[PDB]
Amino acid sequence: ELPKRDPPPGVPTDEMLLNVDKMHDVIAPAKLLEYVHIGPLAKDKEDKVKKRYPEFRLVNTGPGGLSALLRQSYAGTAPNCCRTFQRTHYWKKDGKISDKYEEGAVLESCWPDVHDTGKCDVDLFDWCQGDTFDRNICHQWIGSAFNRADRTVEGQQSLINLYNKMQTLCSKDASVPICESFLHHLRAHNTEDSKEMIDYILRQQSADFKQKYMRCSYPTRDKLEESLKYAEPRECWDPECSNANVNFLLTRNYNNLGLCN
């Protein structure tokens, strides 16, 4: 009294033979508001999947617990993310960060090119000011000086604020290594004529800087007259300033004094 028909046997595809566990090199690298797919999940494990991924929110994609993880945030802390360009993401475990997955470690990713969006200019300025400056990172941190193509209201404001904030320190004392990398990058980083620190505080500096950080470029009166005498024996760095590296040279004094072929 009933025409019965057993359903055909089910062939499971890749879309269902998954578990979020043992899937961590796919979940971690992702962008905002993208539905990267994980397999079916029970209601009990969902909380765990939520705890491991704070920037991600579980969305019920389909039946049988078919869910995806939607990224709505980038919880990247400054003293860990921008301190190392390598770290696209890190993992917290027992209060310590690591670059390798572990059971129970909480994922924390980073904004794409976070140094191009200026999230870290406040903290990186106060971290490696001295005694911990890294010739790798805080030297590449000034690569944004000509790579900031954010074109955003917040980003441009952050860039200008960083410029002025670090110009204060490079005005107080140039001998800071970060300022040294700054005058290294200042050759053509901002168009070709945007450099005037020559006349603000570097116009009148200490006498020791005459003998320690600007030898034949910022001379005394007798040495000022001697420098222009003959045919450039003191112009550029021939006589003794050649031994001193080209670290802190006034930009106007750079093209003018240092032009020896």
Partner 1 sequence: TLNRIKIAPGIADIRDKYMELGFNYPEYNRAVKFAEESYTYYYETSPGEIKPKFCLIDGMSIDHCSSFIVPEFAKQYVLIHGEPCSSFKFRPGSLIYYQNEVTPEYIKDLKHATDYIASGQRCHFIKKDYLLGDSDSVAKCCSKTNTKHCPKIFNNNYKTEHCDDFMTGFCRNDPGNPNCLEWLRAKRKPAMSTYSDICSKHMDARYCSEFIRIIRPDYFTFGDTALYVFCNDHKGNRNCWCANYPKSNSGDKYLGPRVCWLHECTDESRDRKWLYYNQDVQRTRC
Partner 2 sequence: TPFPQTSKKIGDDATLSCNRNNTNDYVVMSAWYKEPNSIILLAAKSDVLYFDNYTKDKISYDSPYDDLVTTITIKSLTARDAGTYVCAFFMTSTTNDTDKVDYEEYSTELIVNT
Contact residues for partner 2, defined by CB under 8 A? 31-35, 59-62, 68, 70, 149-153
Take residue 210 and report the two structure tokens written for it.
Answer: 């005459």
Residue 167 in contact with residue 197, Cβ under 8 Å? yes
Residue 66 in contact with residue 42, Cβ under 8 Å? no
Residue found by looking up tokens 């320690």 in the block:
212
Cα–Cα dist 73/55, whole Å: 5
C-alpha angle 18/19/24, rounded to 5°?
Answer: 105
The residue among 35 and 200 lying less far from partner 2, judged by its C-beta, is 35
106 binds partner 1 (CB under 8 A): no
Cα–Cα dist 6/115, whole Å: 60
Site string for partner 1, 58-97 (x = CB under 8 A): ---xxxx-x-----------------xxx-xx--------
Q: At residue 237, what is the residue type?
A: W
The residue among 149 and 228 lying less far from partner 2, judged by its C-beta, is 149
28 binds partner 1 (CB under 8 A): yes
211 binds partner 1 (CB under 8 A): no
24 binds partner 1 (CB under 8 A): yes
Binding site for partner 1 (CB under 8 A): 1-18, 22-26, 28-31, 35, 37-40, 61-64, 66, 84-86, 88-89, 112-115, 135-136, 139-140, 142-143, 147, 185, 187, 236-237, 242-246, 258-261
